[PDB]
């Protein structure tokens, strides 16, 4: 169970003559290649007066610590963000980078927003760096967060998260030689090796219909064709 409740706070960056704001954020983790972001907020969703719900928030909105259902306390990156789960002290929403999380009041003609900057390091750790999750294609290494509560925080995880792609290479096996007729509509990191004993350590980024011939040992080869983790082919002769 959470040990803290929302409060009015001086924002790190808010509009001048409005910096005396309600609704604020503490820390955010966005180190994930996941589209979801784990928030430690002080403008908390997943806290009503009763604690943890999945579609309710609480805030001190220049008022007092009290709750209503999601309406006036909005997460944003700078554009809307749709929450996924609320877990008391920690909130989970998708606001992909997690370096800018904005809690803002979007009523009346005025646009009030407090935005909090965070100390996230989002780096490669996969086999390639890639686009945030869409719905389409095969995943790639990420460091997602849990998408349900346990009531205090959401836990850190490493898994694999969705990535866009285009039709996979037309492979042709022939005498000790494998041509990959490629049709990326999207930048793919192409990594190769033979899987026999031939090294072929070949990275290249490809896009557009092109061909890339590779040697084979005749004992398979891996070509990883971006937005997939290693794909491998084998045969008596490849």
């Amino acid at each position: 169970y959470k040990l803290a409740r929302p409060y009015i706070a001086d924002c790190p960056n808010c509009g001048h003559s409005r910096c005396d704001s309600p609704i604020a954020i503490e820390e955010v983790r966005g180190d994930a290649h996941a589209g979801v972001i784990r928030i430690q907020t002080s403008a908390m969703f997943g806290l009503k007066t009763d604690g943890v719900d999945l579609a309710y928030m609480s805030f001190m909105n220049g008022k007092t610590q009290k709750s209503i259902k999601i309406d006036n306390l909005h997460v944003r990156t700078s554009a809307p963000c749709s929450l996924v789960s609320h877990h008391g002290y920690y909130i989970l929403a998708q606001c992909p980078p997690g370096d800018t999380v904005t809690v803002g009041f979007h009523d009346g003609p005025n646009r009030h927003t407090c935005t909090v900057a965070h100390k996230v390091e989002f780096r490669p750790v996969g086999r390639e760096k890639y686009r945030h999750p869409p719905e389409h294609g095969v995943e790639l290494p990420c460091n997602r967060y849990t998408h349900k509560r346990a009531d205090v925080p959401f836990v850190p995880v490493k898994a694999k998260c969705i990535a866009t792609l285009a039709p996979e290479p037309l492979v042709e096996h022939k005498h000790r030689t494998l041509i990959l007729h490629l049709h990326p509509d999207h930048p793919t990191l192409l990594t190769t090796r033979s899987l026999g004993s031939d090294a072929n350590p070949t990275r290249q980024w490809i896009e557009r219909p092109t061909t890339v011939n590779f040697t084979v040992t005749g004992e398979g080869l891996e070509y990883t064709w971006g937005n997939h983790p290693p794909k491998r082919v084998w045969a008596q002769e490849s």
Partner: protein, 49 residues
């Protein structure tokens, strides 16, 4: 993947400030004397040096 934490600095107006070590991985402090003269300079302080 570290996160850099920059907390607000300990300013003593009209006296020296000594660092208090903290076990954070690359915790570094430095004591800077005579930072802010009389009145404004980045903090209001009566004392100069």
């Amino acid at each position: 993947k570290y996160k850099t934490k920059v907390p607000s600095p300990v300013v003593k107006c009209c006296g020296a400030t000594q660092c208090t070590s903290k076990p954070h991985p690359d915790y570094q402090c430095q004591v800077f004397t005579g930072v802010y003269p009389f009145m404004w300079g980045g903090a209001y302080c009566f004392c100069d040096t």
